[PDB]
Design a protein around this nucleic acid. Sequence first.
DNA 1: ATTGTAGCGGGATGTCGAGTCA
DNA 2: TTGACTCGACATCCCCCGCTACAA
Lengths: 499, 53
Amino acid sequence: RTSRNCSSNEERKRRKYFHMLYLVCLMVHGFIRNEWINSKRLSRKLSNLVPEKVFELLHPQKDEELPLRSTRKLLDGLKKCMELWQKHWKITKKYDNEGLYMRTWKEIEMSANNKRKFKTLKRSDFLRAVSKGHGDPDISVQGFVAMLRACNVNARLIMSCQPPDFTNMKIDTSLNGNNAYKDMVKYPIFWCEVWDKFSKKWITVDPVNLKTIEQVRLHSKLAPKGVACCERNMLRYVIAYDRKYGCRDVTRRYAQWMNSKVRKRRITKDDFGEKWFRKVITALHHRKRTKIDDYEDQYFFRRDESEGIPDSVQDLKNHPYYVLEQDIKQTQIVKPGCKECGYLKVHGKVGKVLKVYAKRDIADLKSARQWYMNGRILKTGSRCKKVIKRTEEEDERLYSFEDTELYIPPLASASGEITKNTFGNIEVFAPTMIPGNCCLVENPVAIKAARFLGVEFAPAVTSFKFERGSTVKPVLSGIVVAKWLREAIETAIDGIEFI
Amino acid sequence: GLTVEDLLSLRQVVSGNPEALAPLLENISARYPQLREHIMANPEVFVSMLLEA
DNA sequence: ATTGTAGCGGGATGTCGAGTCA
DNA sequence: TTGACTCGACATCCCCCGCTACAA
C-alpha cells in the first residue's frame, strides 16, 4: 500500500544546500567564460569573419522618422552573422554526457564513484577552439558572442543554470530513456542577447541550436516546453553577462509564469533565499548601473504586471501577489472596503469559480499577548477584529497592527534600578522593551557578574522554552542594566574566572 | 578555510570543466563540513575567492 | 523529615509524491 | 492531457513563568 518515494528532511536540507553550492559555481563559470570571451587576441582574429557590408548592418545609422527600420537593419546583420558562424564552425560535437544540463540527485551521488574522464581546458584551448571552429554547442555560441563583441556590438552571453532540483523530494528519481539525448538538446543552455539602441529592447539570438532570432514580448522559443524536455532543463535562473562585466538575472524575459510556476523552483522563494541570491549576483556584477539597465527593468516591470492571476489552483499556493479566499489564514482578515481583485475558473468543474485576493489587501492579526512579544500593546479603546478558538477551549481576540502602539518601558532611576515583574525579571522580547537609558547584555554569566559587583540590575527574559509536561519555562538570556554600568559589567564578564 | 590543492582543482573545474563540478562538489563538501554555513552566510566571499584563484 | 533531583510539549498549518477521477 | 482532489507521513510555526514523588 505504501510505496512512498520520499527522503529525509536531512536529505532535503542537503539538497537545498547542494543546490546553492552547485548554483554559485555555475554562475561563476558564466562570469569567467564571459571574460574569456572578451579576449582581445581572440577578438582580433574573429573580426575578420565579418564583411564591411554586414558590419555596417550591425551599426545602422539612426533613422529618425521611423526607428523601426533601424532595428530591421540590425536584425539583418544578426542574421547574416548567424549564417557565417554556421559556416565558421566546421566540426560541431555532441556533448559527452549531459553537458551543463540538469542532473538527477541519484546521478550526482553516483558520480563520486566513477570519476569518469575529464580533459582539462583553460583559457588558451578555449580560444584556440573558437578559432578553428571545433567544439560542442556551448562553445559554439560562446564564440559567437566573441565574434559579435569583436564587432563592437553589445552582446550578452546568456546562461540558463541547471543546478539539481532542490524541490525534488524523491529518493529514486528516474528518467525516460527514449529519445533522451534528442530531447535534452531540444533547447540551449547558453545563448546570446543583443541590445537594440533603436527600439530600446534586448534582442534574443540563438545562433547555434534553434537558429532563430527573436524579440521577446510574452513568449520565447528558447524556454523549454513539454514534460520530457524539462527533466533535464528546468528554467530557473537565466543569467546575462555583458562586455563590461555586468551580471543580471534575466529569467523574467524567458519565463512565461515567473511568479507562480518558476518561483517555486528557485532558491529565491523564501526570504533568506532572495537575499542569498542577491549577494551572489552582487558578487558578480562588476559595473555600475546604466540607463539600459533601466529600460530593461521597465520591460521587466511590465512583464511582471501582465502575468496576472494564474490559470490554476496549484499555482496560487504561495503566490507572491495573490491568494485564494480559501487560503486566507485564520489569523488574517480582509482589509476594510477591499474585495477580490479577480476570479479563477477551476479546471474540471463547470462554472465552479474561486475568489482571488491581492495579498496587499489582506491583514495579519495577532492576539494581545502575541503583540506584546513584538513589544506592542493595544491603543486605548481598541476594537478587536476577529475571534477564534484556542487550546482547553477559549476564544482568543485578535487585533490589527494599527490598533496597537509601542511599549515604552520606564526609564531606570539614578541608582540604575530597573522596574520588574512579579517574578523579579524584566521582559525583553524586542529592542523596544529595553529601557531608553539602559542596555541589554546577553551572556550566560551576566547574572553572575552583576551579582558579584552587586550593582543594580534585572534579568532579561527574552523568550520561553517548551517541553514535556504541558509546561513552559522562561529563558533568562541576560541582564538589563543602566548604560553607565555597561563598561563595568563587560569587564566582570571578561574576568568571570576570577569571581 | 580551505586547502590550496583543492582550491586549484576548484578554480579549474569551475572555469574550464564545469561538467565535472558534480563529483568535485560531492567530494569537497564531504571533506569540508563548515563550508556549508560559509556558503549560506557569505556566498559573495566564496565567489570572490574563486575569481582571484 | 527536606531538598534536590529526575520523570511526566501539541494543534493548526504546510509540504511533496502518488493514485484516482473527469 | 492535465489539473483538482484525496491520502500518507513527514515538516514548520507559534504556545508564551509546574508539579508529583522518591531517597540519602
